[PDB]
């Protein structure tokens, strides 16, 4: 249903510039329809090309940028997938993945892994942390997909996946004014610029903590052989009820009852138990996904003050302590931070 602004708003049938694949399915992603995997009929003289794994992912076209370029690709760098390219078909969109796993390499979806092989787990955390490192401090991001990043992973690699996210370039005009929203060529800048917002300290902290929670949710998903309900961004779903069901950390009320979760291998204990109120505020920050443009309601949210300011600062510092102990738990380094 598309119309023009002339004296007759004509109904336009959404044109289909690409045969939509009828056999839509990915065995690595059985629960996902938009996820489709497939192995091409490579030149059969060469057994090597047999390994080439190809996965297309479906998604809306809004996720493309002003340049018609999909947002996660901006954060992509030194990618591991053998190749990638975008696919625009009307509102729908597709994103095919060329991969060539080595003679024995075998990827698999991060979801529901449970995997306790901290070597592979650390491979994935390195991939995701380096990827999100491409984010700028005054640039921020939300993930309308879920509260984590999808990916697959083999013993040799951890291939990232396309994400339903939205870039948002905030701008903190430092009092000492000595990347700008008006980066076009001067003529074009005369008309318009990025749909920027007002950056500030609190927004920086909010986005940083948000990406950190994304990291931790992905880590959970990796070490959860059961459902990791944290991903769920359902409108009806509320974190209040979520932690009411899950309860709080037995070892300390402050944190969540993540000690009792179901783990593919060794349970780590109350290690996976983050403070609760920080998670709550994180979910509130995440709710931004539905109205990204209205930034005043979510930009500083994780770092906002509910004295209330003292409690917010203290509990954010508690979450920072949690990140410190987490990094120590995996021998990590905050140079990415």
């Amino acid at each position: 249903p598309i119309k023009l602004d002339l004296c007759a708003s004509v109904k336009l049938t959404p044109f289909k510039p690409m045969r939509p694949p009828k056999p839509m399915q990915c065995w690595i992603h059985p629960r996902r329809a938009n996820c489709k995997v497939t192995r091409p009929r490579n030149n059969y003289s060469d057994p090597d090309n047999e390994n080439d794994m190809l996965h297309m992912t479906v998604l809306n076209s809004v996720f493309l940028n002003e340049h018609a370029k999909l947002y996660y690709r901006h954060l992509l760098r030194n990618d591991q997938a053998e190749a990638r390219k975008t696919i625009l078909n009307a509102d729908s969109v597709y994103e095919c993945m060329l991969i060539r796993p080595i003679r024995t390499e075998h990827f698999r979806s991060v979801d529901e892994a449970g995997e306790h092989n901290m070597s592979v787990l650390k491979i994935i955390i390195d991939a995701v942390i380096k990827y999100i490192g491409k984010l700028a401090d005054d640039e921020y991001i939300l993930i309308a997909d879920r509260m984590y990043v999808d990916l697959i992973y083999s013993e040799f690699r951890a291939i990232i996946l396309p994400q339903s996210a939205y870039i948002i370039k905030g701008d903190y005009a430092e009092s000492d004014s000595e990347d700008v929203c008006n980066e076009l060529e001067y003529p074009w800048k005369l008309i318009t610029a990025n749909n920027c917002i007002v950056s500030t300290d609190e927004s920086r902290q909010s986005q940083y903590i948000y990406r950190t929670f994304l990291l931790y949710n992905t880590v959970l998903t990796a070490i959860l052989k059961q459902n990791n309900p944290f991903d769920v961004i359902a409108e009806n779903t509320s974190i209040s009820i979520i932690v009411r069901n899950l309860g709080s950390c037995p070892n300390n009320k402050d944190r969540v009852k993540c000690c009792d979760l179901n783990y593919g291998g060794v349970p780590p204990g109350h290690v996976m138990c983050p403070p609760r109120e920080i998670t709550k505020k994180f979910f509130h920050y995440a709710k931004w996904v539905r109205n990204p443009n209205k930034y005043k309601r979510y930009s500083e949210l994780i770092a906002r003050q509910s004295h209330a300011r003292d409690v917010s600062q203290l509990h954010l510092l508690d979450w920072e302590n949690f990140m410190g102990e987490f990094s120590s738990y995996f021998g990590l380094h905050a140079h990415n931070v």
Binding site: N252, K253, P275, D310, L314, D318, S328
Partner: protein
């Protein structure tokens, strides 16, 4: 590093948490008190627990801003609502 600070943090946390509640070992108290001593931010507690030795000496009378400082110091190791009654 003279003392691996992770176990010092953890021991201090768990001991003070159980004390607030109302299994441990003397070496655990040693690690917690050295955790304290290393933490430059907790000198008020240094002197509190130093005086407490032997007789109960004197709880120092502190400006309320320093009271908030020590209360935040405690809450960091847990945060939960607290008061001077619990810390005493």
């Amino acid at each position: 590093e003279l003392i691996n600070m992770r176990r010092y943090r953890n021991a201090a946390r768990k001991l003070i948490h159980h004390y607030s509640l109302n299994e441990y070992k003397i070496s655990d108290v040693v690690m917690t008190m050295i955790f304290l001593l290393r933490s430059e931010k907790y000198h008020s507690l240094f002197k509190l627990l130093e005086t407490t030795f032997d007789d109960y000496t004197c709880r120092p009378q502190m400006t309320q801003v320093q009271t908030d400082t020590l209360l935040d110091a405690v809450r960091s190791l847990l945060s939960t609502t607290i008061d001077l009654t619990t810390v005493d």
